[PDB]
Amino acid sequence: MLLGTFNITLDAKNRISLPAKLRAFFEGSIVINRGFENCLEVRKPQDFQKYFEQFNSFPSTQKDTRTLKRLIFANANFVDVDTAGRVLIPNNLINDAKLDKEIVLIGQFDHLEIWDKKLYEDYLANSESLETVAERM
Amino acid sequence: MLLGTFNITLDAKNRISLPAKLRAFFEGSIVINRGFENCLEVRKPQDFQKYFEQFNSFPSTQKDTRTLKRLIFANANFVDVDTAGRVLIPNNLINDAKLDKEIVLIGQFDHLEIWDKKLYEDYLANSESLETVAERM
Amino acid sequence: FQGHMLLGTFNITLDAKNRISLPAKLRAFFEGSIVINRGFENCLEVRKPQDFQKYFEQFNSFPSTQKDTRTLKRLIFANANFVDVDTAGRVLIPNNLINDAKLDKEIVLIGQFDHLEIWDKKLYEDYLANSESLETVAERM
Amino acid sequence: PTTENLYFQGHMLLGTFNITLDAKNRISLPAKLRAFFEGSIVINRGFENCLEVRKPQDFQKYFEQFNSFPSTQKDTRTLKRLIFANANFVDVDTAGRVLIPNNLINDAKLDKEIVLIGQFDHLEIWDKKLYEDYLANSESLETVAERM
Amino acid sequence: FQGHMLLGTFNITLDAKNRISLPAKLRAFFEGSIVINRGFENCLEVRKPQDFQKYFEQFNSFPSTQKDTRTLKRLIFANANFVDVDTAGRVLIPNNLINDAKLDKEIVLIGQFDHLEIWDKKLYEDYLANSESLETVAERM
Amino acid sequence: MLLGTFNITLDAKNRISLPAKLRAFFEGSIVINRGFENCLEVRKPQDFQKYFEQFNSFPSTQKDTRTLKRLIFANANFVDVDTAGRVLIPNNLINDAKLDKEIVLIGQFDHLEIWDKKLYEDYLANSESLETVAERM
Amino acid sequence: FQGHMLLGTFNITLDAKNRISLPAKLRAFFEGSIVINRGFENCLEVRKPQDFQKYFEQFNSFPSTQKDTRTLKRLIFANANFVDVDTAGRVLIPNNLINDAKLDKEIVLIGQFDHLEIWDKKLYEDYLANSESLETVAERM
Amino acid sequence: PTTENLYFQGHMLLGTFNITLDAKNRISLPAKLRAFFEGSIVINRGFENCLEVRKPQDFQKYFEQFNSFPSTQKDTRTLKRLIFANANFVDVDTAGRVLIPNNLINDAKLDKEIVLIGQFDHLEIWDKKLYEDYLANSESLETVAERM
């Protein structure tokens, strides 16, 4: 289970050190891919496996399904968690998530999201209430 | 199963002593996270596991689902129940639930909810009848 | 069977210490513990913990993301309690529940197969007095 | 009673029977019917004022049918309360007699002259008059069926 | 199979004692007892008790909280009876049923696989005389 | 597996010799009954059993169902396939299918249909295209 | 798998005796017998009997009381045939089918996984020439 | 390749790879990819002019998803004919190379400079230009997703 919020800094070599309470969750490898609202998702390969299983539940004969799958997997990568718990974030992803300095890692149980601190707070700042959003489920 | 209403006080160190009939239900660890209507939910990690899986039945390709998942899990945490049955509530959650002094714990079978006494009574004060709400299910 | 089906109507009195003696044909059904909780139309339900377990699971088929679901669950479980049936088959009804069901003196226990309901005699008779026919209600199912 | 018949009488309740209500409010199960029932039955009030009689097991299955009904719905609760609060276990004595409860005698307007009709699953008890009136009114077999 | 399917049309006479002799190819299908009950379009149905058992199971799939379901079941089972097939393959048709089907003299037995139907010859031909085509009726299923 | 089209003649005693490739499929007995569009169907009693169970999924409380069932089964019959592979078609069925001389047997996998050569060709003559009919399924 | 998957396009000639030699990669797939039947858009389908069995079972999920269902089943099975694949891997195509598919000289066999389709080279190319895009057609599924 | 990496490389196809089309029309599977495939693959033309590559077993599963489609429907038949008539088994040689069929080379406008993108289930082969154009156009991740 990936839970919580974490404030960390983006390395000079574009790496982020997984907190610690988090390193435990991951093995020596993760899949990254770009997320929604410009955030970058991080999962254990096995979880990515299941995540993809949720996509295939979608038609695929439908153009949108193909665009979604291509946008996701075409920017997805395996990344080894080094001995120090660090992860090198790909150039393409650094840009997609506007990662600069000051990152926010939020646990989403299944996966972990990497945010630019500013963007995340802005997301939170906008964004409707918990009751409002929930009522629409 | 968690049943009942309990009136307790918020510790000076921001902790609450699980009643007793309740300690039984929990092991040495719980997940907390913010609830709906400003209340903080408490569950055994295993139950949190099942609670989460209930979300994955929701689109995910939908913006609202993502907001919901981010408002919940980003504010969820593992908290150890100390030897005395006390649980230390995180700062963020204390504020989200406007927890001050005088808490109300209500058993919701699956989980437990932590309320600010005032807010809860106000919630109960407003809130339609049991029959009215039920008829709409 | 005859001890696994809660059926019938029973007229009993509320104890001076707020307890009710389970009839007998009924004690059989229950072990040494029951869950009580407030019911609909001001009545208090009584079930074996296991049956309460199943009753609840039915509620998990309800959204939860929906506001009404949360209100329902909160009005029900916040007012539910475990109560031990003493050696004499008596059950002490909590203060809050005594009030919610306007229990005073003269109780009516009706078996609902799954559970048992506790009613203030007056309120129950009024409920029955109002209330549409069996055929009418049924046709709407 | 041939063993072939015996076998079915214990499997299905069929037929119409005219009997009298005892002075002590009992009815003697016909015979072809006693076979179907053990030593205990559940009675409960039925629809159109008729009282139903079932073997406890069958009553068990009958009830599970009601659990597919909401219960958060006020009507469901009324239905369940009108039925089970007026349901009772009754022992079929040695002579095949069943003593019908006061409340049920009144609800079905039972006086003297009863009609027992087998509904396969259960058996219904009617006041002779009420039953014939029910049959007198009541649309045709084809009419009712077409609406199913 | 060549003895577990009621197929065909048979013209027979109603006994002076209100009985019908099962053809023969038919007797085979039935044991020593049958269930009769009134059918639709005034015809009387005949089944082996086991088949009646299954036929009933097709009804209970119907509400029963619905007034129509109760009327249907009462109209059917209240006129249903067990009838022994005598040594000569004859079946005594109850008075009530004789009247319901306007049975007089000259009966038509049509096999419906599951059951067998008894018709007054006139009424049956009239039914056939009216009645839409096979294609028409079928298209509406 | 009953497949194909066969042109045969109606016997003087109202019988048809099952082709041969066909005799194989049937045992020594068949059920005949009138079909749709005036054709007479032929099946193995076992298959007739399954065909009937298909009707039982239909109302029965519906007048049309009862008519359908009465038009089919009242005109169904068991017929023994003699030693020479001949089948004597009942009077009633000969008339319903306007059988005279020159029959067309078409395999329908499940069953076999008997047609008056003229009527069949007319049926085929009219009758929409394969693609047209299929598109409406 | 490489012999449990009919894939590809094959250009072959129609024999002087109206036969076609199964490519080879294809013979593997088939045993010594196949069912042919006329396909959609004038093409003739070819399957292993077992697969034909499954293909048909799909058609039974269709009413049958519906006129269209009956026409469909009659247009298909009445024109279906068992054909033995000879020692040389040749298959003799029935006269009726040769005509239905306008088979002359120059055939195109396309694998459809489940089955194989036989086309007149011209007709196939025309089909391809017309025919919307892969994306267009797919979006409508 | 750590044994863990190898494990995952044989479980999912991920990543973007830039390679060159051989003079004999072959591509050398990257390496992290060869692990995923055995000695044979099925190719077939994809959507948006891209050619798909799968392990025969996966192609098996891919196809089954198609049988949920009518078939009596003209479009289903066109879809199945446009896909499978242009599908082929291709052996991955000893050097990890795959020779792409003429027809598929043309259908995907393959020339020189190919992009292989892993779609977990399968792998897509693109003409570098066409792929970037596809990416260039193409709405946002959030936008597309919101319509699912």
Tab-separated table of N, CA and C in Angstrom, chain A residues 19-70:
chain	number	residue	atom	x	y	z
A	19	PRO	N	11.432	8.083	-0.697
A	19	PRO	CA	11.373	8.365	0.740
A	19	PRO	C	12.020	7.368	1.707
A	20	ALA	N	11.551	6.123	1.696
A	20	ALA	CA	12.065	5.071	2.581
A	20	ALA	C	10.881	4.199	2.926
A	21	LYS	N	9.861	4.809	3.515
A	21	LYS	CA	8.655	4.064	3.840
A	21	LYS	C	8.163	3.525	2.501
A	22	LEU	N	8.577	4.200	1.432
A	22	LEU	CA	8.213	3.824	0.077
A	22	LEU	C	9.141	2.795	-0.579
A	23	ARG	N	10.458	2.949	-0.437
A	23	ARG	CA	11.386	1.995	-1.051
A	23	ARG	C	10.931	0.572	-0.787
A	24	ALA	N	10.476	0.338	0.436
A	24	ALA	CA	10.008	-0.975	0.839
A	24	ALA	C	9.029	-1.539	-0.188
A	25	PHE	N	8.053	-0.733	-0.571
A	25	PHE	CA	7.036	-1.159	-1.522
A	25	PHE	C	7.601	-1.677	-2.838
A	26	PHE	N	8.592	-0.979	-3.360
A	26	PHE	CA	9.182	-1.342	-4.633
A	26	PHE	C	10.368	-2.271	-4.520
A	27	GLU	N	10.589	-3.041	-5.582
A	27	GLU	CA	11.709	-3.965	-5.664
A	27	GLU	C	12.872	-3.149	-6.224
A	28	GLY	N	13.545	-3.677	-7.238
A	28	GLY	CA	14.658	-2.949	-7.815
A	28	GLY	C	14.299	-2.337	-9.154
A	29	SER	N	13.026	-2.430	-9.517
A	29	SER	CA	12.585	-1.896	-10.794
A	29	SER	C	11.148	-1.389	-10.728
A	30	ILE	N	10.855	-0.363	-11.518
A	30	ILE	CA	9.512	0.203	-11.581
A	30	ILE	C	9.184	0.575	-13.024
A	31	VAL	N	7.910	0.834	-13.292
A	31	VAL	CA	7.489	1.278	-14.624
A	31	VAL	C	7.020	2.705	-14.352
A	32	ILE	N	7.396	3.662	-15.194
A	32	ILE	CA	6.975	5.017	-14.904
A	32	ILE	C	5.818	5.618	-15.718
A	33	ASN	N	5.935	5.800	-17.021
A	33	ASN	CA	4.807	6.381	-17.792
A	33	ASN	C	4.196	7.706	-17.286
A	34	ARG	N	3.686	8.524	-18.203
A	34	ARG	CA	3.076	9.796	-17.827
A	34	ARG	C	1.673	9.532	-17.287
A	35	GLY	N	1.258	10.318	-16.295
A	35	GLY	CA	-0.068	10.158	-15.719
A	35	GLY	C	-1.018	11.236	-16.204
A	36	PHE	N	-2.142	11.399	-15.517
A	36	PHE	CA	-3.125	12.412	-15.892
A	36	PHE	C	-2.861	13.701	-15.102
A	37	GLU	N	-3.286	14.835	-15.648
A	37	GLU	CA	-3.067	16.125	-15.010
A	37	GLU	C	-1.560	16.420	-14.848
A	38	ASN	N	-0.777	15.885	-15.784
A	38	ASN	CA	0.668	16.075	-15.816
A	38	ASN	C	1.371	15.579	-14.584
A	39	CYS	N	1.302	14.285	-14.294
A	39	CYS	CA	1.968	13.857	-13.084
A	39	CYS	C	2.918	12.666	-13.066
A	40	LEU	N	2.976	11.824	-14.080
A	40	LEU	CA	3.916	10.702	-13.930
A	40	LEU	C	3.482	9.713	-12.842
A	41	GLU	N	3.235	8.478	-13.255
A	41	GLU	CA	2.821	7.441	-12.329
A	41	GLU	C	4.006	6.498	-12.120
A	42	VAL	N	4.086	5.846	-10.971
A	42	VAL	CA	5.166	4.907	-10.755
A	42	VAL	C	4.518	3.680	-10.163
A	43	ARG	N	4.829	2.518	-10.722
A	43	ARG	CA	4.267	1.267	-10.231
A	43	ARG	C	5.322	0.159	-10.224
A	44	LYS	N	5.004	-0.947	-9.555
A	44	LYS	CA	5.878	-2.101	-9.551
A	44	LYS	C	5.425	-2.717	-10.854
A	45	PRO	N	6.332	-3.352	-11.603
A	45	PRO	CA	5.944	-3.960	-12.877
A	45	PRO	C	4.690	-4.820	-12.798
A	46	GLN	N	4.547	-5.584	-11.721
A	46	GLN	CA	3.378	-6.455	-11.553
A	46	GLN	C	2.102	-5.631	-11.520
A	47	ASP	N	2.152	-4.509	-10.819
A	47	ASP	CA	0.984	-3.645	-10.726
A	47	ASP	C	0.692	-2.997	-12.066
A	48	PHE	N	1.739	-2.726	-12.836
A	48	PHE	CA	1.526	-2.139	-14.138
A	48	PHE	C	0.759	-3.194	-14.934
A	49	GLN	N	1.158	-4.452	-14.773
A	49	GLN	CA	0.519	-5.563	-15.458
A	49	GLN	C	-0.989	-5.483	-15.239
A	50	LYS	N	-1.397	-5.359	-13.985
A	50	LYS	CA	-2.815	-5.278	-13.656
A	50	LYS	C	-3.467	-3.992	-14.138
A	51	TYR	N	-2.707	-2.911	-14.134
A	51	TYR	CA	-3.214	-1.631	-14.592
A	51	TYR	C	-3.576	-1.752	-16.069
A	52	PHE	N	-2.695	-2.373	-16.848
A	52	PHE	CA	-2.921	-2.557	-18.277
A	52	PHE	C	-4.143	-3.435	-18.504
A	53	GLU	N	-4.374	-4.359	-17.574
A	53	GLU	CA	-5.515	-5.264	-17.661
A	53	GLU	C	-6.812	-4.474	-17.564
A	54	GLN	N	-6.746	-3.320	-16.905
A	54	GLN	CA	-7.910	-2.460	-16.768
A	54	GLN	C	-8.168	-1.683	-18.060
A	55	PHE	N	-7.117	-1.426	-18.834
A	55	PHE	CA	-7.265	-0.720	-20.105
A	55	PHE	C	-7.905	-1.577	-21.163
A	56	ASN	N	-7.398	-2.794	-21.303
A	56	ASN	CA	-7.928	-3.718	-22.284
A	56	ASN	C	-9.417	-3.970	-22.130
A	57	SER	N	-9.986	-3.582	-20.997
A	57	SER	CA	-11.413	-3.777	-20.836
A	57	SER	C	-12.097	-2.804	-21.804
A	58	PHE	N	-11.293	-1.917	-22.392
A	58	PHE	CA	-11.780	-0.945	-23.360
A	58	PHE	C	-11.656	-1.468	-24.786
A	59	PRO	N	-12.718	-1.287	-25.585
A	59	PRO	CA	-12.896	-1.685	-26.981
A	59	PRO	C	-11.652	-1.918	-27.817
A	60	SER	N	-10.913	-0.853	-28.105
A	60	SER	CA	-9.706	-0.962	-28.923
A	60	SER	C	-10.034	-0.831	-30.400
A	61	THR	N	-11.265	-1.168	-30.759
A	61	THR	CA	-11.698	-0.995	-32.135
A	61	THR	C	-12.075	0.477	-32.186
A	62	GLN	N	-12.194	1.074	-31.000
A	62	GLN	CA	-12.508	2.488	-30.856
A	62	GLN	C	-11.204	3.286	-30.918
A	63	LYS	N	-11.165	4.290	-31.791
A	63	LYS	CA	-10.001	5.158	-31.974
A	63	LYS	C	-9.476	5.699	-30.640
A	64	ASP	N	-10.375	6.146	-29.769
A	64	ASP	CA	-9.956	6.698	-28.481
A	64	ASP	C	-9.159	5.732	-27.622
A	65	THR	N	-9.527	4.458	-27.682
A	65	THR	CA	-8.832	3.442	-26.910
A	65	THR	C	-7.399	3.354	-27.417
A	66	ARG	N	-7.230	3.406	-28.737
A	66	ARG	CA	-5.898	3.328	-29.306
A	66	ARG	C	-5.066	4.558	-28.936
A	67	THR	N	-5.679	5.734	-28.961
A	67	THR	CA	-4.946	6.942	-28.607
A	67	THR	C	-4.495	6.852	-27.147
A	68	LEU	N	-5.408	6.460	-26.271
A	68	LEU	CA	-5.109	6.330	-24.850
A	68	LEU	C	-3.936	5.375	-24.620
A	69	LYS	N	-4.046	4.168	-25.165
A	69	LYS	CA	-2.996	3.177	-25.030
A	69	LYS	C	-1.670	3.672	-25.577
A	70	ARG	N	-1.691	4.367	-26.707
A	70	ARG	CA	-0.445	4.852	-27.280
A	70	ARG	C	0.158	5.983	-26.465
